[PDB]
Amino acid sequence: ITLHPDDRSEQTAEIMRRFNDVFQLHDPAALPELIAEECVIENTVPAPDGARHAGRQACVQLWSAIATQPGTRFDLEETFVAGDRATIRWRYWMADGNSVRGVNLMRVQDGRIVEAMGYVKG
């Protein structure tokens, strides 16, 4: 985690560590405590806009499925934190052996993830 010094930067880093570990450990147990009631994900697909998932339940369900899909994984390229925001660059490996690079733009409020926006190479 690259930290830009800022009031809550260390808190946001801790949130991103635990968030990233869900995927690295394929273990979604931490997801609910990290996600705001009103959390929104703007997913990577489909263009033009990306789907939208709203509310803790939808966000937990989506990320849980992602974290536990057989034959898939993520390599973390860089997590950069500043204040209540972070960027997480990654490479996603698919069950067919292909991969794609992407990024999440993350925002926290009251110590929980309220916004996650995903993008990919197209």
Task: Give the footprint of a second copy on this chain (CB under 8 A).
Answer: 4-6, 44-50, 80, 82-83, 85, 87, 89, 91, 98-103, 105, 117, 119-122
Question: Tokens for 39?
Answer: 């959390």
CB of 67 to a second copy, least distance (A): 20
Amino acid in position 98 = N
Given a contact cutoff of 8 angstroms between Cβ atoms, the answer to whether 64 and 36 are in contact is no
Task: Identify what 98 binds: Cl ion, a second copy, none; CB under 5 to 8 Å per kind.
Answer: a second copy
- Burial of 3 per CB tally in 10 Å (0-12, 13-18, 19+): middle
The least distance separating a second copy from the CB of residue 80, rounded to whole angstroms, comes to 7
